[PDB]
Design a protein around this ligand. Structure first.
Ligand code: FAD
Ligand code: FAD
Ligand code: CL
Ligand code: CL
Lengths: 525, 525
């Protein structure tokens, strides 16, 4: 066996594998290095046997998941369940504990169970990805839009369980999640909300029930295994028009963010949260690093200016979209253009004035956002993996109060700490409605131990620096779990203590991905 | 002592009362019948010592709440904590168990702590009611609106903890809740979300943290005591315009609901969920029953027609509001008017065509809704208490899929069952966004034991008949909790059993309001 979980002998593991095989089928229990290797983190920051699963199981049904969980309890074998296992930047499909048996639910449990046009929702199994839901809604003829993240291989269900986000009005995946089937750690099947009431047609309509709302308990946690999820879908509006706004100066960031906030907070004229990214982020989607700088140390200011000038973009680019009839779009576009063009040097384009054209890389950048913001998934951003050989990412994503001045300070400090470690800094700032996200997407060499260590060291420092300023991280790689968990220190970590009480109540044997979000079962504390 | 909790002797109770008095102050710990009886349910359906508390305490601070909870654990005395204690139709301020010590937080913990205009939120203590927050926002100059429920004495916090609702685009109070301070059942203080991170300014901006989202655990549950809550507030739009749509036929309800859904599901042109009430509900806001019918038996068709003709309304009235610049309002109003006026006999008005005029009861009814829908709280609907002497209510409010045909069947069935028990039926139907609510507001004589029994018997049959059709209740009176919890029967009540596991995790001594939402602590199961 490539790895074994602490406390479990080769003989005990082999007996568990025999029971998984007998009950699930031997074709669906994999121990071969060729298969299990594929579920190691694509973007590691560690060099050894950390985060390596022992085996992978491909369950075919909720019933298969139930029997696997019962066998895992009997043998004390930890499980890591995921939908797509493409959680790049946060661990991929890798488990918290070496030797964990992986459950890749999406391999076989991959159906769109229902599309309802009248009530604008879909019902998905784990393996439905953005591409597949887009195609299923297209083939249904329903006038509904999906809300994809940046990569079309992301799981509708998996991304939601991470509190992940896209870029339409429906960007908050956790908000439009409604009704879950969940296998609990003892093997019992739970249906949340109105799914608890036999015959209810409101399982995917109304996120409620008599008593507490518990769907949020299953986000970034190790309390159950989701087998089914409703996802409410935005009705397609009559028209959608996207825009790009290019800023000449690195120092324009404060004015960009202070301009954004009052246009967004009322949900109009910014009907969806726009993104604000630095030139390096857009450059990495359409070019390789060597086009700008042959020297391997930190990007110079002149290399960043080359990017701006040759691509025809800005040091900062705002992307957004307006939705509705043309009369409403035209009003909103004028308010947006008028506000941002107060910033000296700013330039405003739409997908009409900058249409997609072969070899016009600025047009391909806007086209990519226009697609995502109109519910058309793509994998345009996957080009960042080609920025240099083996380029991967490892997110630092703090949330803070909207503030131009504080965005510029986060930017300047992250630039300094990233340059200190020789790691390239792709930046995106977002005002969702009232909160400001700073997305630090570092590109490092995932094949190079020295690059891994610089990136891990850089990021632990960013977490410390962010925490000192009141900037908290709300999504984190496996290796960061304990450090980020420890920053929520109010009242001797009462949040983590509350998480542990719930963990021990719902998973008494501590079988589910121990240490997810710093939540360790009693047997490991 | 007027009542004692099962298992707690007078000597034990007196010892706990002496500790509450010593720590909180004797002037804030009340055991006299005159003071405690104030906290008995205003709208009982029981005749005895059911739901009668033993004592009331007025805590002055989070610290007072902590020390009361610690003492309660030492003595095994159940607590029921509430903000305003005006949960009329669901038990008022009454506890689940006879002899519960009541904590009326809002008596002394009653400050608005923040009105943030730039990031459009307020921070409230338990005792802040809609009237107070409205006045505090008005006097601050901040261009923000609140979202009141129907009665202005409702607690911003307390209503939220019941998954209560209002009528603006911010109607879903649970959605705009962000950041809670909670005293847990052991006395430990928890700050949810970014309040866990010292220094964070995002406690009331971003409903997230690393790990699970747990504010939903504190809705309709007995897991903690909230001492502070952020409430995000809609930015005030340039203009707002309300409308009333009158339908001449009782049988117009199916077309009304089927017209509403496609206008609401995309959040335009119905930007807030409109209400659809029957003539009796409107009549009861501007008149008394005897103005229409002297016979005490069920309201006749002729009495309802007298209401329609003399008030100048409809058997069904739709009330809604449009928000934004006038160019947008005028487009939406034209879409709404054009849609509903295809129903034969329908009549459309706005608060401009039917402005408030003395004697013009239709204009008073529209004005009352225009106020609620524009963030101006009132107590206009408090007139239903005067429909006849001692009139009160006892809600049956199931949720279902939007359907004209099913709405009309629910109406006809509820009219029949209410007629059979001699109970007046005030009806509202709402499509929220994708879900349909049926609000059955019965009016019964709260002082008359026969009327209490008819109301309870009627309601238990409504719950039974609703469940058989897949219509589930998501908010219920203390006396209905077990019956309603039992309708969520999927997988041998896995929902209830999961609530119970969380309950015993977070409240091992089972002190907090045992039985809330049918959630009983291990010591009483
Ligand atoms: C590299 C990258 C990543 C990225 C991105 C851009 C780039 C260049 N842009 C993103 C964005 O716009 N929005 C966003 O939310 N994420 C973005 N990412 C990160 C990543 O690509 C995506 O989030 C991706 O969609 C996540 O991976 P996936 O969808 O495959 O999800 P998963 O690995 O299956 O699940 C993640 C975790 O959730 C829990 N989980 C998931 N499914 C289950 C089930 N069924 N039961 C229980 N738990 C489940 C697990 O903890 C799992 O590890
Ligand atoms: C009679 C009536 C009722 C009504 C209504 C119209 C009429 C004519 N219209 C309503 C509406 O439009 N929307 C709505 O949500 N409710 C409406 N109602 C019912 C009722 O009037 C209101 O819901 C009212 O706002 C509720 O009472 P209040 O606001 O005073 O809340 P509370 O009694 O303090 O608390 C209710 C329960 O919540 C838990 N709770 C409350 N505060 C705490 C704290 N601090 N800690 C822990 N738990 C808390 C308790 O379970 C409490 O019993
Ligand atoms: Cl993605
Ligand atoms: Cl109310």
């Amino acid at each position: 066996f490539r790895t074994l979980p602490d406390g479990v002998s080769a003989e005990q593991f082999a007996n568990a594998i025999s029971e998984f095989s007998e009950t699930i089928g031997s074709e669906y229990v994999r121990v071969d290095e060729a298969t299990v290797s594929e579920y190691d983190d694509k973007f590691p920051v560690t060099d050894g046997d950390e985060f390596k699963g022992s085996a992978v199981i491909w369950p075919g049904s909720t019933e298969d998941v139930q029997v696997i969980v019962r066998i895992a309890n009997k043998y004390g074998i930890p499980l890591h369940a995921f939908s797509g296992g493409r959680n790049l930047g946060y661990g991929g499909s890798s488990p918290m504990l070496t030797g964990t048996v992986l459950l890749h639910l999406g391999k076989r449990m991959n159906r769109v169970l229902e599309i309802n046009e009248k009530l604008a929702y879909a019902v998905v199994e784990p393996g439905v990805d953005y591409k597949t839901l887009y195609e299923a809604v297209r083939d249904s003829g329903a006038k509904l839009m999906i809300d994809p993240a940046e990569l079309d291989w992301g799981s509708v269900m998996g991304n939601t369980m991470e509190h992940g986000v896209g870029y339409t009005p429906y960007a908050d995946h956790s908000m439009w999640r409604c009704g879950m089937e969940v296998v609990l750690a003892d093997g019992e099947v739970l249906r949340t909300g109105m799914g608890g009431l036999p015959g209810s047609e409101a399982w995917h309509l109304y996120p409620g029930q008599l008593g507490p709302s518990i769907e949020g308990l299953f986000e970034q946690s190790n309390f159950g295994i989701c087998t089914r999820m409703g996802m409410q879908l935005m009705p397609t509006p009559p028209e959608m028009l996207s825009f790009a706004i290019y800023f000449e100066n690195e120092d324009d960031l404060p004015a960009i963010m202070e301009t954004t906030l009052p246009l967004r907070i009322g949900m109009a004229p910014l009907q969806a949260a726009p993104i604000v990214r630095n030139v390096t982020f857009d450059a990495a989607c359409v070019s390789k690093r060597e086009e700008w700088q042959t020297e391997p140390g930190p990007l110079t200011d002149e290399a960043k200016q080359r990017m701006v000038d040759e691509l025809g973009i800005g040091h900062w680019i705002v992307y957004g979209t307006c939705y509705g009839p043309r009369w409403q779009i035209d009003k909103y576009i004028e308010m947006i253009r008028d506000a941002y063009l107060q910033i000296p040097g700013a330039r405003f384009e739409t997908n009409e004035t900058l249409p997609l054209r072969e070899g016009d890389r600025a047009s391909e950048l806007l086209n990519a956002r226009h697609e995502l913001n109109t519910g058309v998934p793509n994998r345009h951003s996957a080009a960042v993996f080609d920025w240099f050989p083996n380029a991967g990412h490892f997110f630092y994503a703090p949330v803070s109060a909207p503030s131009g001045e504080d965005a510029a300070k986060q930017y300047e400090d992250t630039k300094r700490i990233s340059d200190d470690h020789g790691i390239d800094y792709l930046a995106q700032f977002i005002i969702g409605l009232r909160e400001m996200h700073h997305i630090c997407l570092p590109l490092y060499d995932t094949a190079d131990p020295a690059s891994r260590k610089e990136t891990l060291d850089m990021t632990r420092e960013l977490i410390r620096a962010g925490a000192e300023e009141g900037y908290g991280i709300y999504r984190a790689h496996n290796v960061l779990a304990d450090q980020v968990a420890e920053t929520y220190s109010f009242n001797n970590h009462i949040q983590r203590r509350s998480h542990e009480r719930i963990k021990d109540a719902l998973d008494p044997n501590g079988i589910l991905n121990p240490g997810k979000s710093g939540i360790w079962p009693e047997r490991l504390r």
